[PDB]
Amino acid sequence: DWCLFG
Amino acid sequence: DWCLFG
Amino acid sequence: SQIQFTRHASDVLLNLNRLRSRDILTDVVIVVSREQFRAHKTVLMACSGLFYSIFTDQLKRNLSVINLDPEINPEGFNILLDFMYTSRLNLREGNIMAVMATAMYLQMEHVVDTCRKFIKASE
Amino acid sequence: SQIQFTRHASDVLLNLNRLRSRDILTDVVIVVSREQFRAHKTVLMACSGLFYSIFTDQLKRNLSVINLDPEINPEGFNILLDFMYTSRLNLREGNIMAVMATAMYLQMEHVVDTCRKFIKASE
Ligand SMILES: [Cl-]
Ligand SMILES: [Cl-]
Ligand SMILES: [Cl-]
Ligand SMILES: [Cl-]
Ligand SMILES: [Cl-]
Ligand SMILES: [Mg+2]
Ligand SMILES: [Mg+2]
Ligand code: NA
């Protein structure tokens, strides 16, 4: 899964 | 830190 | 078993990328349209289905120089090699087709799936 | 503005442990008296202050066989080697002193810190 790093 | 693997 | 150090894998990857920067224990150069990229074969095998398949053969495992297809975009490869050592990628309008193509070539299934999703969202 | 793959670092570590199991690309044997442990020097450098310090010298970095103090508990070492490759430890009444001593020898500061805390809670 992927997400925003920020 | 450490945590429970679960 | 029951105790886990939650930052351990990320810290290992960070330290591996530092060794790459310093050219410590690197054992391969990948060549893409006359641009050269040093790397650790263990990291390549652990991240890419192409490199995994190639390097399971002992003969190709020993190669110090490996050439990719001359149509591969070196910036796409650079992006994906940095992803291998960081878990992070910039996926944007201007690079998505080159990244997806390169990730397809390298057999990087999770990057491919994400690229697919991003392309479909723009019709 | 980057995208991150949350499972990537853990998957990389999993696949490196698979390579160790298969004896693929391992470049050192660690000897503790009569017990032997094959490993990747890059993973050793990434996890242990001891191995990082000795492998900064090119001469020692080239060694294929490294001997540890034979007073080291070899199961203590095995526990800690598996931790390097998994992020996980079984820390329990019957092994904590051996694991702590071994982690101090290997300069694995976060494991030592956690052992200290577990011991202190039983006083
Ligand atoms: Cl080197
Ligand atoms: Cl992937
Ligand atoms: Cl022994
Ligand atoms: Cl016990
Ligand atoms: Cl540690
Ligand atoms: Mg070489
Ligand atoms: Mg493009
Ligand atoms: Na070689």
Side-chain angles (χ1 to χ4, degrees):
Chain A
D1 214 46
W2 69 268
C3 68
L4 301 182
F5 180 59
Chain B
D1 276 82
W2 70 271
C3 71
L4 299 180
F5 182 60
Chain C
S1 184
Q2 292 152 314
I3 303 304
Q4 200 211 345
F5 288 67
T6 198
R7 313 272 167 254
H8 179 71
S10 291
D11 288 354
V12 170
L13 207 62
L14 179 69
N15 291 333
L16 292 179
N17 203 23
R18 288 176 182 168
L19 299 177
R20 178 167 69 113
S21 286
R22 291 189 174 183
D23 205 34
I24 292 169
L25 289 165
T26 49
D27 58 351
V28 76
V29 47
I30 311 302
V31 187
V32 194
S33 296
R34 305 187 182 74
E35 293 193 30
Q36 295 191 17
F37 302 89
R38 67 206 183 258
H40 297 96
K41 284 185 273 207
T42 47
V43 174
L44 298 182
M45 283 191 77
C47 291
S48 158
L50 180 62
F51 291 121
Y52 188 88
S53 292
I54 293 298
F55 296 147
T56 49
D57 166 47
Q58 291 188 334
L59 182 75
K60 289 186 289 301
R61 196 186 302 172
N62 291 327
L63 294 173
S64 297
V65 187
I66 298 292
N67 302 305
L68 312 185
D69 184 319
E71 294 182 18
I72 295 291
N73 191 322
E75 193 52 45
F77 183 71
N78 195 36
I79 289 156
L80 290 173
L81 183 63
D82 287 347
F83 165 83
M84 292 179 200
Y85 282 84
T86 65
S87 320
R88 306 186 299 280
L89 160 64
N90 224 98
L91 286 193
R92 57 181 181 77
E93 194 187 15
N95 76 10
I96 185 157
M97 300 307 284
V99 171
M100 192 176 169
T102 312
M104 284 172 71
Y105 177 81
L106 296 180
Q107 306 168 32
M108 290 171 76
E109 70 170 298
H110 305 284
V111 173
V112 169
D113 290 333
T114 306
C115 285
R116 280 190 202 287
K117 286 202 294 290
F118 281 31
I119 291 159
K120 288 179 198 174
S122 297
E123 309 280 54
Chain D
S1 187
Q2 306 168 68
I3 297 296
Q4 191 181 222
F5 285 66
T6 51
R7 305 201 308 264
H8 181 74
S10 62
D11 287 344
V12 172
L13 203 71
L14 182 65
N15 291 340
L16 295 171
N17 204 24
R18 287 173 177 170
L19 297 178
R20 177 171 69 113
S21 287
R22 296 186 55 184
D23 202 35
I24 297 175
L25 285 162
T26 51
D27 58 350
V28 73
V29 52
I30 306 308
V31 180
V32 185
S33 187
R34 303 190 169 75
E35 297 225 12
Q36 300 173 17
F37 306 85
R38 289 201 58 78
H40 303 99
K41 286 187 271 199
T42 47
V43 175
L44 297 182
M45 285 195 72
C47 302
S48 155
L50 180 58
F51 288 121
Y52 187 88
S53 286
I54 64 153
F55 296 154
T56 61
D57 162 47
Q58 183 65 254
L59 185 72
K60 290 183 289 297
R61 189 194 303 168
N62 285 331
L63 295 177
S64 298
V65 180
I66 298 294
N67 305 317
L68 307 190
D69 185 336
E71 297 185 0
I72 293 287
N73 182 320
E75 186 56 40
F77 182 69
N78 193 53
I79 287 166
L80 286 164
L81 185 61
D82 288 342
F83 165 80
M84 293 179 200
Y85 281 91
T86 66
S87 320
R88 289 180 280 95
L89 276 179
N90 177 220
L91 203 52
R92 59 184 172 75
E93 186 168 24
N95 74 5
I96 185 155
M97 298 315 288
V99 171
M100 186 166 167
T102 315
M104 291 169 58
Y105 178 85
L106 298 176
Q107 306 168 32
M108 292 169 75
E109 71 195 317
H110 301 298
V111 175
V112 171
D113 284 347
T114 303
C115 289
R116 284 194 202 284
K117 295 159 196 177
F118 283 30
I119 291 161
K120 204 198 185 182
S122 283
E123 295 180 346

